[PDB]
């Protein structure tokens, strides 16, 4: 029911990190969840969730009738009710079609997935447009830096004009701001925008703030989404985010020096 | 004569940082240089070079006959023989055409530019393909992490199959590896791939290693390409890179802790 795109425009801000962590948190809360790699050509989700060697069929194979969801969905290694739909290594802009994508989303809804997390590619070309097109909600992943922040602002424009909902005048895509790689030291020395600074500029509700954290690269190398590291500030920050996404309120930690 | 694309596939590895720095180093060595923003419509090069307020016309305006190069080219603020061709804020995948782009490149060659540095968008969709299509050389911008490194490998495949040169069997695009955000501490603790590790995997000649450096965000905020900061390891690393690009050999510093 809740299709959430993880987007940014700006490259390398942490979309996939966030997609893996958030999808895992949701599933840990009992919500049946699939996280989908929309980053066709340059797949990465399966590496981050550490299910690489179980990749048999992909998003494109399914669209193209070469495999069913049942064949393509990978059951997560660590967390119940979590599934992964990996991206094709093929490059082919049209490979993902609106019609195909739409059908996949209908089919997953039909498997009673509560949450469908869509890991977007960078940019605002067709790759990222596809990823957000059918979104109900959007997580704008933003580093507290001018460029990330500008690109995020632009992404908002696109959310409000080139999504299905914005083209058919339905309720607009719900917008969540997720600040990532927040370095409070750097912020007090005036090189990064404060949480507040960014909020003034973007003007959407903050869903999370993920501290800059050495545990994230470690999580990646292990193929273990950081949230599974219970001692990691970044992990806790993601658990908090998942709480906010589910209606609970939580104070924002790891934002002070 | 030397058209060099700065590419990566992987988002946020530092293509624009590198483009600005390298383009500036070349011009500083007396080589007439233009650096072009291919990242339409998430433009960023003009921010990094700090010429934002002088943006009048862009890459698309020129293609579309709405302006000439002379009207669109921005003369750099600090460095002689350096010019900037900013990207359009418009979003339109076709906005840049092969025919248009090709013509622009011919015209710049005609203004006797020795170096044409092309700042690529992330990904391997049409944005990045356009950026590398007419390349003579390619700077593969890579963070010493598994994903960056994988995507860089993939970029190489694309360089050797979907560039003009690879489609007409001309001399292949010359491949330069540029390791960025190299954190020697992290590397010795086994979280980042050593310079050597990456070299085994990518297998192209190293042109530079840019240390992780707080000066880079400072450079960006200032709009002063980091190479102009003479006290910055990152800047020195870029000056070294420019030396290597021009045939000189230099040992790789800031790689040890
Ligand atoms: N909280 C954090 N602390 C430290 N490093 C982080 C954090 N979040 C992300 N990173 C780093 O940022 C880089 C990009 O992460 P990730 O691949 O998730 O970003 P992305 O936006 O999905 O990238 P792309 O644009 O290629 O899709 C990685 O090097 C990751 O380690
Ligand atoms: N040597 C470095 N030290 C510290 N930070 C760096 C370094 N190089 C790049 N960065 C940081 O990495 C992030 C991305 O930089 P940049 O925008 O130049 O990369 P990019 O590949 O052009 O991104 P995109 O994929 O959006 O085009 C920025 O936060 C920048 O400050
Ligand atoms: Mg990603
Ligand atoms: Mg860039």
From Swiss-Prot, chains A, B:
Gene Ontology molecular function, alphabetical: ATP binding; ATP hydrolysis activity; identical protein binding
The entry's ATP-binding residues are: 10-17
> Main site of residence?
membrane
Query: What topology in the membrane does the UniProt record assign?
Result: Peripheral membrane protein
What would changing residue 15 to Q do, according to UniProt?
A: Loss of activity
Instruction: Classify the source by domain of life.
Output: Bacteria
Q: How does it assemble?
A: Interacts with MinC and FtsZ.
Query: Could you say which protein family the record assigns here?
Result: Belongs to the ParA family. MinD subfamily.
Please give the name of this protein: Septum site-determining protein MinD
Cellular location(s)? Cell inner membrane
PANTHER family in the record, alphabetically?
A: SEPTUM SITE-DETERMINING PROTEIN MIND HOMOLOG, CHLOROPLASTIC (PTHR43384:SF6), SEPTUM SITE-DETERMINING PROTEIN MIND HOMOLOG, CHLOROPLASTIC-RELATED (PTHR43384)
Keyword Iron-sulfur in record: no
User: One cellular component GO annotation, for this chain's record?
Assistant: cytoplasmic side of plasma membrane
| Any Gene Ontology biological process | intracellular mRNA localization
InterPro entries named among the record's database cross-references: CobQ/CobB/MinD/ParA_Nub-bd_dom, MinD, MinD_FleN, P-loop_NTPase, ParA/MinD_ATPase
What is the purpose of this protein?
ATPase required for the correct placement of the division site. Cell division inhibitors MinC and MinD act in concert to form an inhibitor capable of blocking formation of the polar Z ring septums. Rapidly oscillates between the poles of the cell to destabilize FtsZ filaments that have formed before they mature into polar Z rings.
What follows loss of this gene? In a minCDE operon disruption (minC-minD-minE), cells divide not only at midpoint but also at their poles, yielding small minicells and long rods. Loss of polar localization of several polar-localized proteins including GroEL-GroES, TnaA and YqjD.
Question: Source taxonomy lineage?
Answer: Bacteria, Pseudomonadati, Pseudomonadota, Gammaproteobacteria, Enterobacterales
Q: Name the source organism.
A: Escherichia coli (strain K12)
Q: Which UniProt keywords apply?
A: ATP-binding, Cell cycle, Cell division, Cell inner membrane, Cell membrane, Membrane, Nucleotide-binding, Septation
Checking Pfam families in the record gives: CbiA
């Amino acid at each position: 029911a809740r299709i959430i795109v993880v987007t940014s425009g700006k490259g390398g801000v942490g979309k996939t990190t966030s997609s893996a962590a958030i999808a895992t948190g949701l599933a840990q809360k009992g919500k049946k969840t699939v996280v989908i790699d929309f980053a066709i050509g340059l797949r990465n989700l399966d590496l981050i969730m550490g299910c690489e060697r179980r990749v048999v069929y992909d998003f494109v194979n399914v669209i193209q009738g070469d495999a069913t969801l049942n064949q393509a969905l990978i059951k997560d290694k660590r967390t119940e009710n979590l599934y992964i739909l990996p991206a094709s290594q093929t490059r082919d802009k049209d490979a993902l079609t609106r019609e195909g994508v739409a059908k996949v989303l209908d089919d997953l809804k039909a498997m009673d997935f509560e949450f469908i997390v869509c890991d977007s590619p960078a940019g605002i070309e067709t790759g990222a447009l596809m990823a957000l097109y059918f979104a109900d909600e959007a997580i704008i992943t933003t580093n507290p830096e001018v460029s990330s922040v500008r690109d995020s602002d632009r992404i908002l424009g696109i959310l409000a004009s080139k999504s299905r909902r914005a083209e058919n005048g339905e309720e607009p895509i719900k917008e969540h701001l997720l600040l990532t790689r927040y370095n409070p030291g750097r912020v007090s020395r005036g090189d990064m925008l404060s949480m507040e600074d960014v909020l003034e500029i973007l003007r959407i509700k903050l869903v999370g703030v993920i501290p800059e954290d050495q545990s994230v690269l470690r999580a990646s190398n292990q193929g273990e989404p950081v949230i599974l590291d219970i001692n990691a500030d970044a992990g806790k920050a993601y658990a908090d985010t998942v709480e906010r996404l589910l209606g609970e309120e939580r104070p924002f930690r790891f934002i002070e020096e």
